[PDB]
Design an enzyme around this catalytic site. Sequence first.
Site, PDB file in Angstrom:
ATOM      1  N   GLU A  55       0.863  -1.214   0.000  1.00 23.78           N
ATOM      2  CA  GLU A  55       0.000   0.000   0.000  1.00 23.78           C
ATOM      3  C   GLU A  55       0.882   1.241   0.000  1.00 23.78           C
ATOM      4  O   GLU A  55       1.976   1.176   0.584  1.00 23.78           O
ATOM      5  CB  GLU A  55      -0.899   0.095   1.231  1.00 23.78           C
ATOM      6  CG  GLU A  55      -1.867  -1.075   1.356  1.00 23.78           C
ATOM      7  CD  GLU A  55      -2.634  -1.169   2.663  1.00 23.78           C
ATOM      8  OE1 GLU A  55      -2.406  -0.358   3.567  1.00 23.78           O
ATOM      9  OE2 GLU A  55      -3.476  -2.078   2.759  1.00 23.78           O
ATOM     10  N   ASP A  69      12.349  -0.930 -14.056  1.00 27.67           N
ATOM     11  CA  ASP A  69      10.875  -1.004 -14.154  1.00 27.67           C
ATOM     12  C   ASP A  69      10.312   0.383 -14.482  1.00 27.67           C
ATOM     13  O   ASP A  69       9.371   0.824 -13.862  1.00 27.67           O
ATOM     14  CB  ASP A  69      10.289  -1.651 -12.894  1.00 27.67           C
ATOM     15  CG  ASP A  69       8.825  -2.048 -13.067  1.00 27.67           C
ATOM     16  OD1 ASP A  69       8.363  -2.226 -14.221  1.00 27.67           O
ATOM     17  OD2 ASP A  69       8.144  -2.111 -12.014  1.00 27.67           O
TER      18      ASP A  69
END
Lengths: 293, 285
Positions: free
Chosen positions: B20, B133
């Site tokens: 989260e 990424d």
Amino acid sequence: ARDITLLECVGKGRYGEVWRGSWQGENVAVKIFSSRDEKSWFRETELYNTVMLRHENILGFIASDMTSRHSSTQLWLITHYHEMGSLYDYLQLTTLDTVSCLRIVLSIASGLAHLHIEIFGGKPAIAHRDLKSKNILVKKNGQCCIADLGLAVMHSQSTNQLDVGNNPRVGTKRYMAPEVLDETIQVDCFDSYKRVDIWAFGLVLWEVARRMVSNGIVEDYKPPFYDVVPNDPSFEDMRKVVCVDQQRPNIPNRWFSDPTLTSLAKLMKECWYQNPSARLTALRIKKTLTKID
Amino acid sequence: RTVARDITLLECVGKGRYGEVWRGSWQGENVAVKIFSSRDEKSWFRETELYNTVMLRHENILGFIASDMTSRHSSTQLWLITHYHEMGSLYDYLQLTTLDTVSCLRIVLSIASGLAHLHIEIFGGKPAIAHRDLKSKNILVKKNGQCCIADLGLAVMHSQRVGTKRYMAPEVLDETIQVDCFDSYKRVDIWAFGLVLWEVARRMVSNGIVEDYKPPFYDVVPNDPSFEDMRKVVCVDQQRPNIPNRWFSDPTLTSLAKLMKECWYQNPSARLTALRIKKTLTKID
Ligand SMILES: COc1cc(-c2cncc(-c3ccc(C4CCN(C)CC4)cc3)c2C)cc(OC)c1OC
Ligand SMILES: COc1cc(-c2cncc(-c3ccc(C4CCN(C)CC4)cc3)c2C)cc(OC)c1OC
Ligand SMILES: COc1cc(-c2cncc(-c3ccc(C4CCN(C)CC4)cc3)c2C)cc(OC)c1OC
Ligand SMILES: COc1cc(-c2cncc(-c3ccc(C4CCN(C)CC4)cc3)c2C)cc(OC)c1OC
């Protein structure tokens, strides 16, 4: 309730500083690492990520932090606090009876066997690489706990993985095994690092046993090799006495009149073979101390 | 002295397989708090090891504040604390927003600036770093119109298939990547940069025309593409994202089309460097 208050400095050196602090109304120890030891901070943090590391005879961690604004970084380790200090501090001040001496050394053996032995399900096998009386804390129940996992190395038998980490730091020179001092240690062999711990444990056993009274006699506290090396021994000073001169700490002859100290002298000699594979395991030491008296 | 460590977690701004992200408050100041899943523990360790090695500080890199590990009864809690960017990710922003020439260029030049800073070795300094990424969800929009690159959880350092599949270079998909050559990882980032440049350019208005937001390869792979889905498009058929005709009426989008094709060569060593992309962009408009 994350806040901490730093109350007093209980240690300063090349490592950085340790503070007694207050947290959730308990004493905590707060280590602030030197820039020079940043790789120790990260290694200790990797070690304390293991939930099954927790043990009565391993220093319990609370938190680890790396903080930064602009170009400066602080590195924090927060642990339980032991107001009696290190075993090194405690032995300067106190003599021991048989019960107290065996309780201390069995507790260290219990902590070291817990580190060395892999738990499956878990905890990798762990070698400490800097065992010494300053890295052992004394607890009010008369047992000890092992501290400072910045040089530790981890191994998993199941997956055949050896993590020696990246840390240019080397162990404390006074406590380095022969194979460390002569740099012939097999660096890709996990068992090599356990055997280095056993050497250092033998030295700590000697430091402790000197302080156990028998027949009205006790020795003054001295660090290992105090009689044969300079005050602040170099790597080469230690190599000279351990590797060239084949020196081992002398057993005071009064120990041979006491059954406990005779048993301990036998046990510390089985930690000190130049041949690392000849040395006892942590488990065998623990079993032996469990039987003694 | 008091060390204030309390962070108030105010609202969840992100939930995923990674854990989260929360908007939090420290001493009156917004921070972003990433709480790691067990799935993604290694990303906390890798980013923390990188920042322990080099304290990156750059306007186009998400600003580090802290790495925190807290012991719990039966688990370890891992938090990464950074600067908070209330406008959210470039991915989010582009859904919701068209661009003019100035905003488009400011976004893409700021990304190239962050990426070149990662890629460069500086002596005296920083090791060279590849992101591994790069994508529009790992870029945040700042109020000043510039962006910053986020998430170094897969980053690799150098001194002289972990990425999002949709953004993987052909040499990653066909397993020909020269894994022993740090420059290989820089070239994988440049491919991904080119896809981000395509996502942004689509949202730039010209002659009253704009494309809808779409992710790269939206027209040729499924919503959640497999490794094989991507390999067949990128490696076997050698497809590249579509350049709409309307771009060739606009000098900025004509220049950006040329730049994105020099990021998408099959041959990794033919692709532009981040520094050469920066120079090209400073000469557009
Ligand atoms: C982690 O992040 C934040 C931290 C702080 C913060 C709080 N107390 C003290 C400090 C500090 C003071 C001084 C030095 C140096 C100065 C020069 N040298 C000779 C000695 C030491 C370093 C650090 C900081 C940086 C504030 C923040 O925001 C305002 C932070 O951002 C959230
Ligand atoms: C070894 O390593 C670490 C140790 C500790 C730690 C934990 N409890 C208590 C202590 C302590 C308190 C007080 C004294 C006294 C000794 C005699 N007197 C003249 C001065 C002060 C000594 C020791 C320490 C040093 C924390 C650490 O990290 C937070 C350690 O690092 C892993
Ligand atoms: C441990 O944890 C967290 C700490 C903090 C934080 C809070 N107040 C003050 C500080 C501070 C900074 C720097 C010094 C310097 C002073 C000069 N001298 C050379 C030694 C060191 C002291 C204190 C910090 C780092 C914030 C946190 O969250 C935002 C923390 O948790 C992640
Ligand atoms: C990619 O990576 C990381 C990103 C961040 C991060 C930093 N600032 C702000 C944010 C954010 C704030 C707000 C929204 C929404 C709220 C709802 N509204 C409808 C649109 C906007 C989205 C996003 C984030 C997610 C932090 C990270 O770590 C602490 C990241 O990981 C490295």
